[PDB]
Amino acid sequence: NNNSALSNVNSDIYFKLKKLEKEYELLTLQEDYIKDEQ
Amino acid sequence: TTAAPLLALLRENQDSVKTYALESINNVVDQLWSEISNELPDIEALYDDDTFSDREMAALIASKVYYNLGEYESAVKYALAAKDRFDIDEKSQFVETIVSKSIEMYVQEASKQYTKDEQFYTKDIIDPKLTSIFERMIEKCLKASELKLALGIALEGYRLDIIESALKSKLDQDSTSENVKIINYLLTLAITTVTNSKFRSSILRKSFDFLMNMPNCDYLTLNKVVVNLNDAGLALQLFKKLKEENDEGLSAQIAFDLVSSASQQLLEILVTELTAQGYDPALLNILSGLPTCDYYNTFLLNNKNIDIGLLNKSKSSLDGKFSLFHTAVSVANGFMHAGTTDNSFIKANLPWLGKAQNWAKFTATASLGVIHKGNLLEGKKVMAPYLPGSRASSRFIKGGSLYGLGLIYAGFGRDTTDYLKNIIVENSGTSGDEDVDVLLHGASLGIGLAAMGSANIEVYEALKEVLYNDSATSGEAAALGMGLCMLGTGKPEAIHDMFTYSQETQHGNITRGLAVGLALINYGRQELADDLITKMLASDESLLRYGGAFTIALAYAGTGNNSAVKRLLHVAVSDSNDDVRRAAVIALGFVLLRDYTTVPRIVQLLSKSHNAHVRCGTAFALGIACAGKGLQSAIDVLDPLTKDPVDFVRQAAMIALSMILIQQTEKLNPQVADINKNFLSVITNKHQEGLAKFGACVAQGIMNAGGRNVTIQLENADTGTLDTKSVVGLVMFSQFWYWFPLAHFLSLSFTPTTVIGIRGSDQAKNKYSSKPYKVDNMTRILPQQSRYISFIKDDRFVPVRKFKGNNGVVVLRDREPKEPVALIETVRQMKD
Amino acid sequence: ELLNAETLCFTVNVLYPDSSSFKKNLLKFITSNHKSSVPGSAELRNSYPASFYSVNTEKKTIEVTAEINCFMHLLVQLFLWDSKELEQLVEFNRKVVIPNLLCYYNLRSLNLINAKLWFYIYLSHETLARSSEEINSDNQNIILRSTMMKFLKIASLKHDNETKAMLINLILRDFLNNGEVDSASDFISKLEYPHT
Amino acid sequence: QVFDERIKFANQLHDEYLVSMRYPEDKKTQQNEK
Amino acid sequence: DAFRLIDTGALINNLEPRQTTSNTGLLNKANIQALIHGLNRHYYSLNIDYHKTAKETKMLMNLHKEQWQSGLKMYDYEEKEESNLAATKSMVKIAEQYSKRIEEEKELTEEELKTRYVGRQDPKKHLSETADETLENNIVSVLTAGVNSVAIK
Amino acid sequence: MTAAVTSSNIVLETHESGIKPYFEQKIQETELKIRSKTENVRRLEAQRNAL
């Protein structure tokens, strides 16, 4: 349904965002560079 | 109400009403939090006193007030002072607030202390009350019976104990395959997220044992582990499992997989062990890779689709007595026909070749080894009339055959090493002539490939004496060759000797060759190689800095490390020596091979700058990153670089575009047609500049490269592992703007896109349609296409294991494994 | 400007958790309307593509009642303030909607809606006390006071900026009216007001 | 002292110009209108 | 620019392409007209790079003894008042010109506004260059005064 | 089945909600930092592009 097995919804979202946030460490690197570039 | 009554009770000195007061305060501590915060040192005085039982209660009040204050660290200190009354907030719809921050606080402590020691469970840095909360929260994930949550958060906390227990308990075999799947998620999550090498090493190695307790399992999963750690003992142990089965199909299949995936240096120690474990010589033939190369030869022999008329139109436009023009074509056609021995180039252009001399004639000879790349059986034979001592007309042909012979045995030249070395040691006593230099130059490039990653100190010594001759072209060629042979070793003698020699030499060519040869040596050595990088950039010499960029590229290849990437970005913008800047951007693509998705966002910044060399380095980096898989955004950043008037920028961009779109069609990317015609237009003009015509024609051959049988595979998806071979092809390719022969190295990066089914008992937009079409065995099958392939349920050839779903060798079980059914002949069988 | 059972039609038509029952009580008292609770007005859940479509929802492959429930609360609360009636009508609105939202942890998106609900409940209650002194109005203000600060603590957890800011206003207003500026001095010292 | 205060107020107005101005610019590159 | 003679016969045989083999170089032609006649009929021109050492750099970059005598040394403060007067007046004229412009700047087509209401040189831009030079000039000057007055006595 | 407003049937799927703010605040903290930093990196880009 939409609330039948809510713990399967919780697990997929938590797992995938862990991978994406390493790549979001690369976006804080990009922000640090352009402050020097200008 | 007011917190005013609550104060009164604290100021009153009767014991009964102070004990009462804490209970009143915690009841409405979600209404009066700001108010009671002002007179809270009173409550610390009660907490200290042991005239109370409500020391727990006194402490628990502080926790709630500090969270609402905004200070989370202290809220948790008082959480742990309070003792209990915290397991009731794990099921409330109001306050879970204080609990969650504790979990976050664990992760802080763990990171500091895992690096010091794995054991931090005996450490007192970690509070036991802090542990209990983190540990039971992960346990509650398993009570709801989703295990990903428990493995996901345990990796972060550096928890080895809980990850060990979790998988061990998941072995419950109600499907062997279901247990293996849970192992796959964790193997992925460690590698891509955690750069901490020490934790990663433990987590991969532990996975092996859980697979192998189960009898039916995936050996693709077992093999993955072996290549990440590069431990030859797991490998021999994997074979020990398979020798107990006496299973012909699995051992042969994972062996083909293994040679591609695992390091060349790794294979050499592995075979010596298998001989003494006791194995059949069939297997040890595979592990050499000589059979496996022939299987690739066949695939290319059959399917290569090449435009011979395009070769003529380019031939007409690009003159042969015009030397630069002649080179572009030789190289280009060499890539297009690359893979199988095709004598079409020779016959098409039969008078045209002889028109050229100097390095244009050097390239044409060595371009034969790009076309005839692989073809090991016939390796000496086809290059035979161009060999020193059967050719003497030109010094160029004599040298350029040795180099072309080296491509032929590139990664395969265990025999070839001695044969090339004889010529070098004969020529290393000379002071050398310019006649000799051209012969000696191709020997040194060739032996480099032949001895690539075989750790020949014989070759290191031999080429050191050539560098010490101080010869014009050969000193640079020798320098490259040592780096190739001694790839990855990180030998400190070699590192220092070459670093010093740059000042010693007075030739610029020779200086450039050393700087980048140190790059090759510090491959995969990341921050063990930090020290040399720092020094190379410290050099006031542009050539040493130019190689420094690539030394980062290779030390930190295929791991997205912010430090590696930061040094490159900063040098690139901040420096005034144009070579160095250009190199640095190209290095970015190499570091970030793995996260190839982030690359266009990062390097859009650099292409924006209108400095020529910056733009030129941008183009190759996108080329490198998206070579195996194309991205729309990647392509766009290149499109206004074919419309920049500077021709160096045009050369790079055209090659990059064909690098991204190698065998991609126009019903697969509607931009394929537009870009392809742009190259043809430059070739037609003879009123465009020669720099441009040179870039355009090289790219043209790259677009049809291999006969459109190959595409570049930076990283295999065989077991999900980086492909070393391709890195070396790409980085040597990038040296071509400064030395035209070195272009030819792109051939190492071409990887066949095919499924080769083998019968095991002799070893002979948004695409998906619900309408199949039939594909024949050993035809070009793209990586994208491999997942839309599914064996027919009941077929005569059925894959032995559950199909990996990507290009490579899949050994088949033939249902009736004895019939005389039609076979595809093999290049090995064609001989004998 | 336009009818009063116009709210009733939408609320009945969607699948409600109890909200329809809560709306209907109010209207029966002022002369009941039961018209347009007949099929085609109590059978359909309002055309949608798949988002909460009539067929999909009745079959219970979906029950995306979530946002729709928040919007139902906003309609009834508004309709009271528009009518300009106080006493009991207010008390009914307060009792139903406050625990409905707190028996689930609101998602980020739903949470910004419920700050506007907290406003109207509080405003009717305050003016009800300022209508007239009553021994029943007085005891109910302690009830109200408790909920305000509890709402704010939830708003802190999700760091949703507009929820918190709106809730901060209501606490300050109530302090100003009760003459507990002493209690308010502390509160303003622990602000960090979002401007986002 | 008086001049010192005015300048800082001016500088903070620049900062508020910076956060606001470039934030919607980014969005137009993101959305499709080509 | 540099030249080097090549054999007349070699040019007949198409051996000017020979001279650029084994690199892309920094190839560019800085001058034609008589140059490209003489190249064609005699020579192969060379590009020019510069060598210098790290010692020689330091010698070249150093060109003042007043390196340390330029932030303690100052200019007369009458000259500074003249400069502030000049600067403020100039930007006052540019502001009136800007004000005439920005009575509209609201109709369709930027280019039409630039002609009609002069945005010829853009008085916004023009005022920015002038503002920024004198603003930076004053911060150094005050800083020089305040260093000397407090430190020396 | 169970509704997506409040959780139907207490401490079966409300026990799941009971352990939900532990997963969810971790990535909300991550979320809040990177939305404003996503905005900020594109902001200072636009600026160095104009320069």
| Residue position matching structure tokens 């932030």 | E71
Alpha carbon of F45: minimum distance to chain A alpha carbons (Å): 7
Q: Do A14 and F23 touch (CB under 8 A)?
A: yes
Q: Which residues of A touch F37 (CB under 8 A)?
A: 27-28, 31
Angle at B643 between CA B640 and CA B649, to 5 degrees: 85
Q: Write the secondary structure of B642-702 as one string of H (helix), E (strand) and C (coil).
A: CCCCCHHHHHHHHHHHHHHCCCCCCCCCCCHHHHHHHHHHHHHCCCCCHHHHHHHHHHHHH
Contacting residues for B253 by C-beta, under 8 A, at least 6 apart: B219, B760, B800, B801, B809, B810, B811
Q: Residue B393: count other Cβ atoms within 10 Å of its Cβ.
A: 10
Q: Write the secondary structure of B488-518 as one string of H (helix), E (strand) and C (coil).
A: CCCCHHHHHHHHHHHHHCCCHHHHHHHHHHH
Q: What are phi and psi of B594, to 5 degrees?
A: -75, -55
Q: Give the SS3 label for residue B754.
A: strand
Among the partner-chain residues E13, E17, E22, the one whose CB lies closest to the CB of B740 is E22
Do the Cβ atoms of B726 and B713 come closer than 8 Å? yes
Q: Do F46 and D19 touch (CB under 8 A)?
A: no
Do the Cβ atoms of C112 and C164 come closer than 8 Å? no
Residue of B nearest to C188 (CA): B34
CA atoms of E75 and E83, how far apart (whole Å): 11
Q: Do F18 and B91 touch (CB under 8 A)?
A: yes
Angle at C180 between CA C174 and CA C183, to 5 degrees: 100
Amino acid at B524: G
Q: Do A4 and F1 touch (CB under 8 A)?
A: yes
Q: Give the SS3 label for residue B797.
A: strand
Q: Which residues are E44's β-sheet partners? A: E4
CA atoms of B785 and B753, how far apart (whole Å): 10
CA atoms of E76 and E105, how far apart (whole Å): 43
Among the partner-chain residues E13, E14, E22, the one whose CB lies closest to the CB of B739 is E22
Q: Do A1 and C64 touch (CB under 8 A)?
A: no
Q: Give the SS3 label for residue B759.
A: strand
Do the Cβ atoms of B591 and B553 come closer than 8 Å? yes
Amino acid at D15: D
Residue of B nearest to C174 (CA): B1
Residues spanned by the domain of E93? 76-153
Angle at C131 between CA C127 and CA C136, to 5 degrees: 90
Contacting residues for B731 by C-beta, under 8 A, at least 6 apart: B516, B519, B520, B550, B553, B554, B590
Angle at B686 between CA B680 and CA B692, to 5 degrees: 65
State both tokens at E55: 């010692």
Quick one: DSSP state of residue B87?
A: S
Among the partner-chain residues F15, F23, F48, the one whose CB lies closest to the CB of B91 is F15
Where are the strands (E) in B39-191, listed by range? none
State both tokens at D28: 């137009």
Q: Do F4 and C108 touch (CB under 8 A)?
A: no
Strand order, beta sheet including B808-814: B755-759, B808-814, B797-799
Would you call F16 an interface residue with chain B, using a CB distance cutoff of 8 Å?
A: yes
State both tokens at F22: 């532990």
Mutate to test the interface with A, among B107, B140, B148 (most CBs of A within 10 A): B148
Do the Cβ atoms of B680 and B697 come closer than 8 Å? no
Would you call C102 an interface residue with chain A, using a CB distance cutoff of 8 Å?
A: no
Contacting residues for E99 by C-beta, under 8 A, at least 6 apart: none
Residue of F nearest to C110 (CA): F5
Q: What is the largest CA-CA distance in chain D?
A: 53
State both tokens at B523: 């491959």
Structure determination technique employed: cryo-EM
Residue of C nearest to A3 (CA): C63
State both tokens at B515: 């700087």
Q: Do C63 and F28 touch (CB under 8 A)?
A: no
CA atoms of C14 and C11, how far apart (whole Å): 6
Mutate to test the interface with B, among E11, E15, E19, E21 (most CBs of B within 10 A): E21
CA atoms of D9 and B209, how far apart (whole Å): 66
Look at residues B751, B748, B820 and name the one whose alpha carbon lies nearest to residue B782. Answer: B751
| E in contact with C (at least 3 C-beta pairs within 8 A) | no
Residue of F nearest to C104 (CA): F6
Do the Cβ atoms of C80 and C92 come closer than 8 Å? no
Do the Cβ atoms of F9 and A6 come closer than 8 Å? no
Do the Cβ atoms of B314 and B323 come closer than 8 Å? no
| Residue position matching structure tokens 């906390």 | B157
State both tokens at B530: 């930090």
| Residue position matching structure tokens 């019903």 | B667
Q: Residue B625: count other Cβ atoms within 10 Å of its Cβ.
A: 30
Do the Cβ atoms of B359 and E22 come closer than 8 Å? yes
Q: What are phi and psi of B699, to 5 degrees?
A: -65, -35
State how far the alpha carbon of B650 is from the alpha carbons of D30, E61, E144, in Å: 28, 36, 52
Q: Which residues are B797's β-sheet partners? A: B814
Q: Which residues of B touch C189 (CB under 8 A)?
A: 34
CA atoms of B507 and B476, how far apart (whole Å): 9
Do the Cβ atoms of B491 and B454 come closer than 8 Å? no
Would you call C189 an interface residue with chain B, using a CB distance cutoff of 8 Å?
A: yes
Would you call F11 an interface residue with chain B, using a CB distance cutoff of 8 Å?
A: yes
CA atoms of B502 and B511, how far apart (whole Å): 5
Strands B808-814 and B755-759: parallel
CB neighbour class for B357 (10 Å; exposed up to 12, middle 13-18, buried from 19): middle
User: Concatenated DSSP letters for B451-489?
Assistant: TTTS--HHHHHHHHHHHTTT-TTHHHHHHHHHHHHTTTT
Q: Which residues of C touch B99 (CB under 8 A)?
A: none
Q: Give the SS3 label for residue C133.
A: coil
Q: What are phi and psi of B13, to 5 degrees?
A: -95, 0
State both tokens at B337: 């026909």
Do the Cβ atoms of B289 and B412 come closer than 8 Å? yes
CA atoms of D18 and D12, how far apart (whole Å): 10
Alpha carbon of C53: minimum distance to chain F alpha carbons (Å): 15
Q: Do C150 and B30 touch (CB under 8 A)?
A: yes
Mutate to test the interface with F, among D19, D26, D27, D29 (most CBs of F within 10 A): D26
- How many interchain CB pairs under 8 A, A with B? 60
Among the partner-chain residues B323, B357, B738, the one whose CB lies closest to the CB of E23 is B738
CA atoms of E119 and E98, how far apart (whole Å): 8
- How many interchain CB pairs under 8 A, B with C? 41
Q: Which chains touch F (3 or more CB pairs under 8 A)?
A: A, B, C, D
Do the Cβ atoms of B273 and B236 come closer than 8 Å? yes
CA atoms of C191 and B38, how far apart (whole Å): 15
Do the Cβ atoms of B267 and B235 come closer than 8 Å? no
Length of chain E measured in residues: 153
Q: Do B28 and C146 touch (CB under 8 A)?
A: yes
CA atoms of B520 and B502, how far apart (whole Å): 16
State both tokens at B119: 């054991």
Q: Which residues are B754's β-sheet partners? A: B780
CA atoms of A38 and B12, how far apart (whole Å): 64
Interface of C with F (CB under 8 A): 17, 60, 63-66, 69, 100, 103-105, 108, 157-159
Sequence positions preceding breaks in chain E, C–N over 2.5 Å: none
CA atoms of C78 and C121, how far apart (whole Å): 10
Do the Cβ atoms of B625 and B655 come closer than 8 Å? no
Look at residues B207, B251, B210 and name the one whose alpha carbon lies nearest to residue B228. Answer: B207
Q: Which residues of B touch E61 (CB under 8 A)?
A: none
Q: Do C157 and F21 touch (CB under 8 A)?
A: yes
State how far the alpha carbon of C176 is from the alpha carbons of C140, C169, C172, in Å: 18, 11, 6
Mutate to test the interface with E, among B319, B321, B322, B324 (most CBs of E within 10 A): B324
Residue of A nearest to C61 (CA): A1
Alpha carbon of B194: minimum distance to chain A alpha carbons (Å): 8
Q: Which residues of F touch C158 (CB under 8 A)?
A: 28
Q: Which residues of F touch A7 (CB under 8 A)?
A: 16
| Residue position matching structure tokens 């209404």 | B31
Q: Do B324 and E21 touch (CB under 8 A)?
A: yes
User: Concatenated DSSP letters for E57-110?
Assistant: HHHHH---S-TTSSSSS---HHHHHHHHHHHHHHHHHHHHHHHHHTT---SS-H
Do the Cβ atoms of C121 and C74 come closer than 8 Å? no
Q: Give the SS3 label for residue B710.
A: strand
Q: Which residues are B813's β-sheet partners? A: B798
Give long-range contacts, CB 8 A cutoff, 24+ apart: B117-122: B118/B160, B118/B198, B118/B202, B120/B158, B121/B161
CA atoms of B369 and B501, how far apart (whole Å): 32
Residue of B nearest to E19 (CA): B323
CB neighbour class for B196 (10 Å; exposed up to 12, middle 13-18, buried from 19): middle
Q: Which residues of C touch A3 (CB under 8 A)?
A: 63
Look at residues B758, B814, B680, B747 and name the one whose alpha carbon lies nearest to residue B336. Answer: B747
Q: Which residues of F touch C100 (CB under 8 A)?
A: 5-6
Among the partner-chain residues A8, A18, A27, the one whose CB lies closest to the CB of B193 is A18
State how far the alpha carbon of D9 is from the alpha carbons of C154, D6, D19, E136, in Å: 35, 5, 16, 18
| Portion 19-48 of F in contact with B at CB < 8 A | 19, 21-23, 25-26, 29, 45, 48
Alpha carbon of E7: minimum distance to chain B alpha carbons (Å): 17
CA atoms of B315 and B617, how far apart (whole Å): 29
CA atoms of C57 and C50, how far apart (whole Å): 9
Q: What are phi and psi of B211, to 5 degrees?
A: -60, -45
Contacting residues for B123 by C-beta, under 8 A, at least 6 apart: B113, B117
Q: Does residue C60 come out as left (phi exceeding 0), alpha (psi in the -120 to 50 range) or beta?
A: left
Do the Cβ atoms of B736 and B366 come closer than 8 Å? no
N-terminal to C-terminal alpha carbon distance within chain A: 52
Q: Do C64 and A2 touch (CB under 8 A)?
A: yes
Q: Which residues of A touch B150 (CB under 8 A)?
A: none
State both tokens at A13: 């979202």
- CA dihedral in degrees (B3, B9, B12, B16; nearest 10)? -170
Length of chain C measured in residues: 196
Helix or strand (DSSP H, E) at B808: strand B808-814
Resolution in A: 6.0
